[PDB]
Ligand binder design. Sequence first.
Ligand SMILES: Nc1nc2c(ncn2[C@@H]2O[C@H](COP(=O)(O)OP(=O)(O)O)[C@@H](O)[C@H]2O)c(=O)[nH]1
Length: 194
Amino acid sequence: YNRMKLMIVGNTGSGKTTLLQQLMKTKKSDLGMQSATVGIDVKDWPIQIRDKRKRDLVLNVWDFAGREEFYSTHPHFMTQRALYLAVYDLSKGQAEVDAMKPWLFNIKARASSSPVILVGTHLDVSDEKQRKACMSKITKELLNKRGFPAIRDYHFVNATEESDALAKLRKTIINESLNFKIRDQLVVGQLIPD
Ligand SMILES: Nc1nc2c(ncn2[C@@H]2O[C@H](COP(=O)(O)OP(=O)(O)O)[C@@H](O)[C@H]2O)c(=O)[nH]1
């Protein structure tokens, strides 16, 4: 079972599908313009982990928008068994990123031991000063008294076309999805009889 279980903290307009279509990418005259909504779904995406076996690990993340539509049930999907992704753009990185605190705390309430990584999508939405304005605020409020740890990492991406920033996104995923284990867990990709 070479699959990682995950959940997203973000909302419509951040750009998660924008990133994904250039990760979990297809052919010509298929993928197009992006939109957003709220409901419950999930997406399966391979991670290029090893130089001799790149195709061996896959992410499976639950997709929903950070609205009361999911938030009211969100506390019941919480577990150390899930890894978390956070997706905001580079304007939101300063202005709205903050929106996930009530979600992060539901995660915390069960386990804050599992990592969360924040990606700043739509890098080009903001200028260098604003991008730094986001970064320089986010990375200062990360750790606290009540048990919420600092984010494990962060990355900024231009997501609408083929992109090296997505390659960097992937590199980040490769490391965290490889380095993180829940106790000395059997690697999920092992002979585990369901
Ligand atoms: N052109 C452009 N659109 C973006 C970008 N990032 C975010 N958006 C928009 O944000 C929306 C995607 O929202 P999403 O994060 O996937 O929310 P979800 O429906 O809850 O998963 C789409 O309308 C995208 O066009 C970007 O890189 N540039």
